[PDB]
Ligand binder design. Structure first.
Ligand SMILES: Cc1c(NC(=O)c2ccc(C(C)(C)C)cc2)cccc1-c1cc(Nc2ccc(C(=O)N3CCOCC3)cn2)c(=O)n(C)c1
Length: 264
């Protein structure tokens, strides 16, 4: 979907991300959207454009939809669904004292439903984390910016020893071999569950990235957050099997989460 930029009305600055400035606006004066203005040199643009239709056809209630692109111009735009409460990481930290544990589990279910859909399309997120989930005006969590890490032009992000690489969300086979798969998204989802139940703490805080890599390679795992029941912790821990083929699928994880909800 090539969106006509004449149909976009820019309204507010939303800050800066890995591709530069993002704005809040409207499409045809009615629909709320976010507009990424892709900073020159920040993205493998020809590669993204050549391959972008698959990402737009990803359609699920728990994904932040990629509505379309503007490519007849410089800089190019990526137009997405707008989420009024911003990223999950900040939402957890700002509302820390108000969450009931049932709401935390509901957040995990939201993300797991999105990831099961992506899994069913054999589409990898590659940077799943609370910072890359967003929250709408009714508290629904949705997964954002799935697949875009592949187009980043930034050595500090693409190198596993770079300061921006998502080391704390990465399984050993990503850290050692750059082997991304459905099972590396599974690992990251476990860390995301830990972020949710810790109410937005940094995983492996006070460890550097390389200390984190060193110690998870030797079997160090994140502790059980106080608000996670043992059943919940068993689910997130199952995502962190050293061997990728011993990790569940998102279909299994979703069944596990629903069973806890039913038992609750
Ligand atoms: C998403 C985003 C970015 N990252 C990126 O592009 C980006 C690019 C690439 C990657 C990888 C390739 C590395 C994976 C990751 C991220 C940067 C900047 C913006 C947004 C953003 C904010 C929204 N939404 C709101 C809404 C409200 C507020 C807010 O200020 N508050 C919330 C309520 O309480 C008061 C304060 C803030 N953001 C919203 O909907 N989308 C769709 C988007």
């Amino acid at each position: 979907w090539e969106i006509d930029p004449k149909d976009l009305t820019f309204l507010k600055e939303l800050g800066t991300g890995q591709f530069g400035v993002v704005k809040y606006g409207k499409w045809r004066g009615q629909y709320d959207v976010a507009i990424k203005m892709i900073k020159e040199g920040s993205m493998s643009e020809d590669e993204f454009i050549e391959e972008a239709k698959v990402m737009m056809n990803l359609s699920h209630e728990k994904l932040v939809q990629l509505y379309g692109v503007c490519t007849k111009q410089r800089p190019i735009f990526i137009i997405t669904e707008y989420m009024a409460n911003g990223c999950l990481l900040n939402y957890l930290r700002e509302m820390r004292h108000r969450f009931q544990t049932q709401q935390l589990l509901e957040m995990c279910k939201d993300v797991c439903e999105a990831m099961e859909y992506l899994e069913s399309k054999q589409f990898l997120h590659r940077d799943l984390a609370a910072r890359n989930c967003l929250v709408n005006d009714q508290g629904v969590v949705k997964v954002s910016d799935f697949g875009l890490s592949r187009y980043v032009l930034d050595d500090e992000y693409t190198s596993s020893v770079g300061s921006k690489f998502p080391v704390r969300w990465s399984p050993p086979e990503v850290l050692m071999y750059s082997k991304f798969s459905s099972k590396s998204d599974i690992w990251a989802f476990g860390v995301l569950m830990w972020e949710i139940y810790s109410l937005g703490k940094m995983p492996y805080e006070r460890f550097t990235n390389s200390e984190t890599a060193e110690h998870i390679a030797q079997g160090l795992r994140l502790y059980r957050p106080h608000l996670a029941s043992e059943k919940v912790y068993t689910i997130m821990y199952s995502c962190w099997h050293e061997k990728a083929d011993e990790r569940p699928t998102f279909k299994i994880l979703l069944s596990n989460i629903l069973d806890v909800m039913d038992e609750n």
